[PDB]
Design an enzyme around this catalytic site. Structure first.
Site, short mmCIF file in Angstrom:
data_model
loop_
_atom_site.label_atom_id
_atom_site.label_comp_id
_atom_site.label_asym_id
_atom_site.label_seq_id
_atom_site.Cartn_x
_atom_site.Cartn_y
_atom_site.Cartn_z
N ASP A 68 0.30 -1.40 -0.17
CA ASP A 68 0.25 -0.04 0.10
C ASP A 68 0.68 1.39 0.18
O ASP A 68 0.66 1.96 -0.49
CB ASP A 68 -0.93 -0.25 1.34
CG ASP A 68 -2.37 -1.10 0.77
OD1 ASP A 68 -2.51 -1.29 0.09
OD2 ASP A 68 -1.80 -1.33 1.97
N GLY A 90 -1.05 6.87 -12.43
CA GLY A 90 -0.30 6.36 -13.39
C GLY A 90 1.01 7.20 -13.65
O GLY A 90 1.40 7.79 -14.51
N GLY A 145 3.04 6.86 -10.95
CA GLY A 145 4.30 6.25 -9.40
C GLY A 145 5.03 5.11 -10.24
O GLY A 145 5.88 4.52 -10.75
N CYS A 198 -2.05 2.76 -13.07
CA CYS A 198 -1.96 2.75 -11.53
C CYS A 198 -3.12 3.40 -11.28
O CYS A 198 -4.51 2.91 -11.97
CB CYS A 198 -1.00 2.52 -10.97
SG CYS A 198 0.21 3.96 -11.19
N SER A 199 -2.64 4.38 -9.86
CA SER A 199 -3.94 5.29 -9.37
C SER A 199 -3.87 6.04 -10.77
O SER A 199 -4.89 6.46 -11.54
CB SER A 199 -3.81 5.66 -8.39
OG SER A 199 -2.46 5.80 -7.93
#
Ligand SMILES: Cc1ccc(-c2cc(C(=O)O)c3c(-c4ccc(Br)cc4)n[nH]c3n2)cc1
Length: 468
Positions: A368, A405, A407, A402-403
């Site tokens: 996380d 986009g 990292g 990802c979230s």
């Protein structure tokens, strides 16, 4: 990017602001290591604002989420008031600054790693500007430090080495017999032979070296403030997961109504995108179809810490769903240790001949916060993704998300870029981690978000070469 002070304390930050600054003066500094602090002056007092980055974005307390610190600063300076940057003199995050380095060692570096116009600055109490000129020789220029001011023996006295270097980059020092001492590019010390990665990781793990290399790369972000106007348009506002994390206009994926928060990454190409929103699922499948993409890399769970990172844009196993003009059947799901593979069939509604298989690689075990403790799982996953892409004739760019986009997406893509150079040119090739990150960052904002990801990229590349 002079407002970023990498080596000062909160107390030092307060003194700087109360003596060398006025109301509206501000600076940013690293904090809890991994966090950042925006120290601002307001009504003869200093406020300390927290900036968090666990690897997805810079999250400013009482503010918004940003792709870079330069982007955060540019926004608040064009919109507590951020009026006057308090400038840093400290040259530690400069590409050309080597500090404790001898004349022979500097000559070794410019002779092997150097070319015409290469320079560096090293350290009694004075400094040396070492330049290579030719097609060749090395010249050493003395830098007097007198009363915390820098000079070359005559003329102007500068407030920092940065002001000195910049000044002499624009107006080069001319030797009496014709030779112009051109400061054309810092010495490229980060470029290394792949086979010697372990030796560089050891030196970088000493007293850390990884922190200096990463912040020197971060210092170059102010050169990447490209326009992101299409993402700012009224019609496109709610097509973004994070209002201020936008695609550059020059690399954005144009849909042939034409917007998606996605960018083409050219190193085999990639599409770096965000996790779908309810209202962008149909724009995602239009993009996959148009780009002829045959592989999608998802590097997030749908929900992490009670927050939705990406909506489910694929049907349940064996189900058929229409997303606007696009049709998708989930043919089969295969669950491995770190990931799940989903075999999808994408087609245009009304055209039977447009059908193609889209392999979705969903990495489900990324922590996380931070990065995995060991790169093995990520490498094995990347290997399978690579082999699938390779087996498909004329496949389009690999979609990675990802979230936000930037990292985990940036991290996966850069690792893939580096392990690919090795695949082609072999173990006896040159690799340059920050040059690669900087090249990917000019195609999408804040690609590779933290020092923990930076270190993970080095660990990943090391582990690949070790098992070669
Ligand atoms: C003592 C000492 C420690 C570290 C470095 C150093 C040198 C370089 C470099 O210019 O080779 C870079 C870079 C980098 C490379 C290429 C591009 Br394009 C953008 C950023 N990022 N971090 C770096 N650190 C220098 C001296």
């Amino acid at each position: 990017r002079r407002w970023f002070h990498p080596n000062i304390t909160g107390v030092e930050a307060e003194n700087l602001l109360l003596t060398r600054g006025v109301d509206g003066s501000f600076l940013a500094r690293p904090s809890n290591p991994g966090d950042f602090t925006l120290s601002v002056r307001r009504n003869g007092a200093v406020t300390h604002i927290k900036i968090q980055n666990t690897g997805d974005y810079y999250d400013l307390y009482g503010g918004e989420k940003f792709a870079t610190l330069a982007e955060l600063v540019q926004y608040y300076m064009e919109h507590i008031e951020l009026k006057y940057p308090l400038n840093c003199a400290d040259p530690t995050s400069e590409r050309w600054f080597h500090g404790h380095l001898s004349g022979k060692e500097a000559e070794k570096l410019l002779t092997e790693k150097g070319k015409h116009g290469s320079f560096l600055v090293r350290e009694p109490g004075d400094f040396v500007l070492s330049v290579r000129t030719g097609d060749s020789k090395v010249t050493h220029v003395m830098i007097r430090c007198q009363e915390l001011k820098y000079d070359v023996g005559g003329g102007e006295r500068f407030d920092s080495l940065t002001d000195l270097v910049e000044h002499y980059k624009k107006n080069p020092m001319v030797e009496t017999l014709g030779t112009v001492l051109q400061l054309k590019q810092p010495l490229n010390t980060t470029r290394i032979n792949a086979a010697e990665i372990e030796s560089r990781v050891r030196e970088l793990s000493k007293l850390q070296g990884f922190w200096e290399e990463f912040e020197t790369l971060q210092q170059q972000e102010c050169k990447l403030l490209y326009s992101r106007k299409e993402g700012q348009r009224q019609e496109n506002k709610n097509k973004n997961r994070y209002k201020n994390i936008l695609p550059f206009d020059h690399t954005r994926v144009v849909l042939h109504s034409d917007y998606i928060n996605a960018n083409i990454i050219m190193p085999k190409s990639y599409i770096a995108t965000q996790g779908c929103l309810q209202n962008t699922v149909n724009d995602f499948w239009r993009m996959v179809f148009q780009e002829n993409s045959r592989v999608i890399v998802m590097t997030t769970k749908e929900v992490e810490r009670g927050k939705s990172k990406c909506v489910k844009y694929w049907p349940d196993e064996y189900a058929l769903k229409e997303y606007g003009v696009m049709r998708v059947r989930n043919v089969k799901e295969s669950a491995a240790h770190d990931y799940t593979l989903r075999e999808l069939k994408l087609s245009k509604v009304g055209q039977g001949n447009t059908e193609r298989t889209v392999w979705q690689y969903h990495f489900r075990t990324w922590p996380d916060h931070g990065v995995p403790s060991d790169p093995g799982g990520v490498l094995d996953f990347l290997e399978e993704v690579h082999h699938k892409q390779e087996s498909i004739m004329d496949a389009g760019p690999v979609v990675v998300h990802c979230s936000a986009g930037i990292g985990r997406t940036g991290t996966f893509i850069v690792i893939d870029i580096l392990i690919d150079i090795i695949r082609e040119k072999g173990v006896d090739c040159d690799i340059d981690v920050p040059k690669t990150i900087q090249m990917v960052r000019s195609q999408r904002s804040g690609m590779v978000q933290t020092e923990a990801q930076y270190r993970f990229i080095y660990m990943a590349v090391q582990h690949y070469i070790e098992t070669l």
